[PDB]
């Protein structure tokens, strides 16, 4: 199962 | 960062003339990911060659397996033709049953 990482952007 | 593909052409099982098998072309170590691979039977392009889904290694370089069912015979020559941005001309690698 994947990680739903919140508001993660470069 | 551009990396030229490594190429191996080989069979799934040890080659015996007249026995059904799979011809593989494994391209690896390349970057970027766009690549053209044909499998050749006596110079001509084999149709409905399939491939694996695009993946990459720990070093970020890409790899792909292209393959087709085939029945090797004594006379028919088989080969892989690869093109990538790193190659000025398509690279042809012949199938050698001992490699």
């Amino acid at each position: 199962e994947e990680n739903l990482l919140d508001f993660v952007r470069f | 960062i551009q990396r030229t593909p490594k190429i191996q052409v080989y069979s799934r099982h040890p080659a015996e003339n007249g026995k059904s098998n799979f011809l593989n072309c494994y391209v690896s170590g390349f970057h970027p990911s766009d690549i053209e691979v044909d499998l050749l039977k006596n110079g001509e392009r084999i149709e409905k060659v399939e491939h694996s889904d695009l993946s990459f290694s720990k070093d970020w370089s890409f790899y792909l397996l292209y393959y087709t069912e085939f029945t090797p015979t004594e006379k028919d020559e088989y080969a892989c033709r690869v093109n990538h941005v790193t190659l000025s001309q398509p690279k042809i690698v012949k199938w050698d049953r001992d490699m």
């Binding site: 199962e1 994947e2 990680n3 739903l4 990482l5 919140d6 508001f7 993660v8 952007r9 470069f10 | 960062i1 990396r3 490594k6 191996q8 080989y10 799934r12 099982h13 040890p14 799979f22 593989n24 494994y26 690896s28 170590g29 970057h31 970027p32 990911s33 694996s52 889904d53 695009l54 993946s55 990459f56 720990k58 970020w60 370089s61 397996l65 393959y67 001992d98 490699m99």
Partner: protein, 276 residues
């Protein structure tokens, strides 16, 4: 014994040829089990191994949404990277990610990973401590500061210590017939005379899983590491892998050479000789 789960992202721009393509593949060890491709007619997470198919509809819809959201996020990431590196909008560029966990025989976290690359170069990675970042350059330092501010490392750590290991445990049980089965190599030595006074001895390992293997030639019990030609381990197409190692030896002196094969599907540690 020991096992891994990794997800691999590629996001690749293609100016003049639509919006950037986003692909995710998931592996347990050397087994692909799930894929997403934003270019698909109906983009969604698709099963690629039998044992994952028994996950329920909620699983598949949750997973598909993660990737659909990531297609949009990574398109934004690519736009952002152009700015960070002062690059024009006319070139094709690639963001890669690999993340996941390694677990030991007891199913406990050995280590977690969350690594990113831009154009095939390291960009930012979560350190083994699961609490700090290594940025490769001053652009990646901008991302690091953003992720420090938002406590991204803490969320990563929670995933890697919890859901990553818990789901891998479940997959290993559901797929135990294949994922927990090591296939030993089938091994032989072939003989190819180069000339009158040298020959190639090629030691072959076929049909093995997982890919990890050691093939070594020894001359009089001494490793021939500088003089062994070794091909990259290659997929056979049936889940299994192949590899060979070759030495060029003087004719008549063939029996001075032994091929040594280590693989978790072995025993022992095999020793092979050319058998005329």
């Amino acid at each position: 014994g020991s096992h891994s789960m990794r997800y691999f992202y590629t996001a690749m721009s293609r100016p003049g040829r639509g919006e950037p393509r986003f692909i995710t593949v998931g592996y347990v060890d050397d087994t692909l089990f799930v894929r997403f491709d934003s270019d698909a007619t109906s983009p969604r997470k698709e099963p690629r191994a039998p044992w994952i198919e028994q996950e329920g509809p909620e699983y598949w819809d949750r997973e598909t949404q993660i990737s659909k959201t990531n297609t949009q996020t990574y398109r934004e990431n690519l736009r952002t990277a152009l700015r960070y590196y002062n690059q024009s909008e006319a070139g094709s560029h690639i963001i890669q990610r690999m993340y996941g966990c390694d677990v030991g025989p007891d199913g406990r976290l050995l280590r977690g990973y969350d690594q990113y690359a831009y154009d095939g170069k390291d960009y930012i990675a979560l350190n083994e401590d699961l609490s700090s970042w290594t940025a490769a350059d001053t652009a990646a330092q901008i991302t690091q500061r953003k992720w420090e501010a938002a406590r991204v490392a803490e969320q990563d750590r929670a995933y890697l210590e919890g859901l990553c290991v818990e789901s891998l445990r479940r997959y290993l049980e559901n797929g135990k017939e294949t994922l927990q089965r090591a296939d030993p190599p089938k091994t032989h030595v072939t003989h190819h005379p180069i000339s009158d006074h040298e020959v190639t001895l090629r030691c072959w390992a076929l049909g093995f899983y997982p890919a990890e293997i050691t093939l070594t030639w020894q001359r009089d019990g001494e490793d021939q590491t500088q003089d062994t030609e070794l091909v990259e381990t290659r997929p056979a197409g049936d889940r299994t892998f192949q590899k060979w190692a070759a030495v060029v030896v003087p004719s008549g002196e063939e029996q001075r050479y032994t091929c040594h094969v280590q693989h978790e599907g072995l025993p022992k540690p095999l020793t092979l000789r050319w058998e005329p």
